[PDB]
Design a protein around this nucleic acid. Sequence first.
DNA 1: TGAGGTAGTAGGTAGT
Length: 673
Amino acid sequence: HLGKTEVFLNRFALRPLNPEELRPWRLEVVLDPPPGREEVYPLLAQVARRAGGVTVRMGDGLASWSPPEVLVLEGTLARMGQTYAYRLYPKGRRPLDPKDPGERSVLSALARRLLQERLRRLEGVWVEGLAVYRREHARGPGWRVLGGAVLDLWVSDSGAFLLEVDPAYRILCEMSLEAWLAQGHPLPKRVRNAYDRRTWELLRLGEEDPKELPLPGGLSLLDYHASKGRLQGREGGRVAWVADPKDPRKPIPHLTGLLVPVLTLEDLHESLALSLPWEERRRRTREIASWIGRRLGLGTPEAVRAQAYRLSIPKLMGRRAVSKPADALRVGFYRAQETALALLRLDGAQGWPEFLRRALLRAFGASGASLRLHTLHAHPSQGLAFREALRKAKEEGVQAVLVLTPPMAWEDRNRLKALLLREGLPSQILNVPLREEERHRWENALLGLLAKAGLQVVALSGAYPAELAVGFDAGGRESFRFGGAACAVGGGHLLWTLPERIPQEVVWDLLEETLWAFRRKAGRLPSRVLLLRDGRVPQDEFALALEALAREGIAYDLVSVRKSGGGRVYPVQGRLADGLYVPLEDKTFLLLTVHRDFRGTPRPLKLVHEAGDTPLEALAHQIFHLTRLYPASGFAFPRLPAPLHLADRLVKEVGRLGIRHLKEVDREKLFFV
DNA sequence: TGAGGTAGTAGGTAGT
Ligand SMILES: [Mg+2]
Ligand SMILES: [Mg+2]
């Protein structure tokens, strides 16, 4: 809807840049030996770092704000095994105009460097990047959570500085990998060099003797680090096998004593609370923004106000107009089919719980379809017969199994599902001390169960620019060269697609198959596809996919999503509403997807239209709606669009169960929710 | 396993 509201950003306008800042000093750079085309840019950057002061790369040369003789006009740096001799020559001043995209960038680069150079000269504070930490929030054996704020400072076309401030924490590991393991914690997924910044993937530990491991040189693992003086101050422990994130499938030996665990919120199981109420955070933010302008000398800050547009509330329906997915059990659903469900009471009496058996019929009646509820009489004990039962039952048309068991132990949960999966039957689990009085649990269970059986419970109705929206998920990696999985939404259809090595191949392969399955279920290829991916993924991993789409005349729109750190939104006067769309920049925009995002403060999505020609408003609209299109959880909507939310589960479970691939589970069957 | 939000994590052809 055009012109509805205004909101406060996580931003603050500050004093304008003085004339001297608008005309930084330009420094000429001389490298010896002369570099190679693609090696100039890095080297330059590196030099701007060595020279010190507030200086950055500008073209083939440099630009600084600090005077020529504060800077290190001469020096040397060794990049990639080759040592160079740099030499700077002050070649006067040169003005820049923030109203030019080109020069504007140099000005914002300059700003960021200033923000951290001024910042770095502050007592009582740890500065990691463009972030500041001033207090200990929580601390335990081997770890500590720091409290601060992540900042950013750039220049506005208006010509003034602009500070972005969002208070946040930092999980720190204060001990080596060896020490940490020695405490009984599980192996960390990520680990970094005790001696520098480099991080790797922790694969295994090894019984291998550090003194036996021979390296490509004929030198010894232990000796190698010993020869680098890394064993002077640290005790190397055992042999840790690590992997370089750029090639996770090539093992690299290493020592646990020289590695530090990269702790994630998960590694600290059980209790610190890192959230913050929207009104508290908004306060801490203002007190940090003011703190900076004072000590930094950027002027008093003024909270930025931006235009916001409320998108229309999604009209989602089953057979009838519904409000939450769960209302489809009473009113009936969108697309019904003949489906046979099986029961697996694997600890109890036997027999379908009165109300479920009632609710089931209750829904198909309101839908008008044939329902056949069978029973599975077997057990993990009687394996051979258990499979005999599964093989028989599925052959009878059973398409989904509702496993009614007491709180299972993880390991056996995957085991059970896995066995069920292999011989063709998805499975929904509902713990067994069941009370009919709790219709939030079994309704959700029935909701998933039906999804797993391949029944569309709800769909949308609108004039969306995309006929198909497919989101991609590469696990928690930043490249599709490891795994990757996909989920599309479309007659509404919900299909999943798994890997059948170059990343661009993986992507065009998740995409093609999605197009093929879609062509089978809809008899047609889509006119336009909406591509949704996680922002922290090179956009080049989609180059091949885009050429293919164009090559077959299929319209598209690539949109990167930023789950965390996209900024925050505060109401000027009133409340925040769902689907609040905040245009924000060239091609980017913020989208608030869930209003009651909790005990802390809502985290809006940050989207970037990287390819295609569709109004940002058009996209926002569809993307916000895809949000209410998620089958499970018929009482709460996902922050992310069904496509991205489903791909995340599709990946998580593909690893939970470690499934290589499924012959058939008809792709309409959402086994992973 | 009923499900979701807030929160933080990957720094934002050598090396071992
Ligand atoms: Mg189906
Ligand atoms: Mg489920």
